[PDB]
């Protein structure tokens, strides 16, 4: 198995414009949304068919109640932050928790918060402490750290529960998450640049670069984003500028899912 991750996000907004939810929560396995909840629907719902098909209605009913509670708690937390920052208007509060199961069998786990889209608090499960970015976060750190049990609980959840959920969902979504669709790769020419283009591939993780005479030229390479094509597969590109005054052997190198390919120009 290659590396996989489980990540759960929360978003709270303190003075949202009309109709827009004050609270939204979404989970992901790798790049795939798997669950959703917001303050408008007030319902926990699957976001992948293999989640819907493997989790019974009592699961959704229970997490619906849990998320209704977590919504209120997020509101209370944001209200407290915005008060301590002495901030008016609409501000955002975010949480992200999750874990990775690496190819080599090792694991990572993480839990962090943001205010107005910037790191606010970051959990260290090895030292059992919170890193605070400013004095508002520092007050919260002091409160959260006062109950040692709460820190221990998060360490356990990140290291044991999160990984168990991830493995559970990886099996549910096996046909999607563990498949491989190799890239179709071509080189286009367009001061003229050579474009190396890949499409049709899954998983989204891919490495594309240009070599000149067998040596890498990272500073002179432009990298395109890995983009969703909309059918479950991804596309990406990389470019370099041609020396009009001297010939060179250029080649595009692509690595995807344990296979390497070279396109010599």
């Amino acid at each position, epitope marked *: 198995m290659r590396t996989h991750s489980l990540r759960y996000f929360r978003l709270g907004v303190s003075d949202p414009i009309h109709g827009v939810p004050e609270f939204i929560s979404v989970g992901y396995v790798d790049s795939h949304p798997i669950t959703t909840y917001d303050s408008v629907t007030r319902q926990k719902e699957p976001r992948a068919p293999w989640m819907a098909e493997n989790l019974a209605p009592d699961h959704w009913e229970r997490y619906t*109640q849990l998320l209704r509670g977590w919504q209120q*708690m997020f509101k209370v937390e944001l209200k407290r932050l915005q008060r301590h920052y002495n901030h008016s208007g609409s501000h955002t509060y975010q949480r992200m928790i999750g874990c990775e199961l690496l190819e080599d069998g090792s694991t990572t786990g993480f839990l962090q918060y943001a205010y107005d889209g910037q790191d606010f608090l970051i959990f260290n499960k090895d030292t059992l402490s919170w890193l605070a970015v400013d004095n508002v976060a520092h007050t919260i750190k002091q409160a959260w750290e006062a109950n040692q*049990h709460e820190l221990l*609980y998060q360490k356990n959840w990140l290291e044991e529960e999160c990984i168990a959920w991830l493995k559970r969902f990886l099996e549910y979504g096996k046909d999607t998450l563990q498949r491989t669709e190799p890239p179709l790769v071509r080189v286009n020419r367009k001061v003229t640049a050579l474009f190396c283009k890949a499409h049709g591939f899954y998983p989204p993780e891919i490495y594309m670069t240009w070599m000149k005479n067998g040596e890498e030229i990272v500073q002179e390479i432009d990298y395109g984003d890995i983009l969703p094509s909309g059918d479950g597969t991804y596309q990406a590109w990389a470019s370099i500028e041609l020396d009009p005054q001297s010939s060179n052997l250029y080649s595009c190198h692509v690595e995807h899912s344990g296979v390497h390919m070279v396109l010599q120009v």
Partner: antibody
Amino acid sequence: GQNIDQPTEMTATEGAIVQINCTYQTSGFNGLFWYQQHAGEAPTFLSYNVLDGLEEKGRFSSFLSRSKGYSYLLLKELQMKDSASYLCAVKDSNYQLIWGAGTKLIIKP
Amino acid sequence: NAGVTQTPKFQVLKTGQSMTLQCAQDMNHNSMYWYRQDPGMGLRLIYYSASEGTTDKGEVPNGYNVSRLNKREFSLRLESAAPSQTSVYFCASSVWTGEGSGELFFGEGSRLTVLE
């Protein structure tokens, strides 16, 4: 969320030490609690364990081994006022509490 | 400063009779619960309320219903009492639900006996 076991009753002598065992088989694990409940009264929180090891609070200690699915509540220098039921409870993967049937502790003066 | 206050302490009921148990907490908690305790088994959740404005069934909801009247109060209703509902009922609360290591705080309990 499936099974918690603890002995029905235990009897020890004033001044001595008693270890009250709790084993659990649950769907996931988010911590183990002990509660004291005097006859005719409300349960009250005694301890919480979620990582492996021994935690001490006064005359009472609580131990957890997650891999063995096992906890004990240890009471030292028993006094008559320790006569009570001791309830074991585990939080499962969905944060639901699974309660043991309780151990009644009888102290011989 | 009273913690969790539930009433009544004792009640005798005839089969088919209605009964409401009251519970209030002044700890500004968000989560409230109703349990029954019977000989030979662990506490069983009847209904719960993770937050003000929502409620759901526990393990043994049949023959009962609840109202989370406001943040402080969570009433349990026996609409048509049955002898099997002879039990000791416990109200409890916690700061939140499914957040960390938080314990339950219990009411004093309500002993119900239901007779034909």
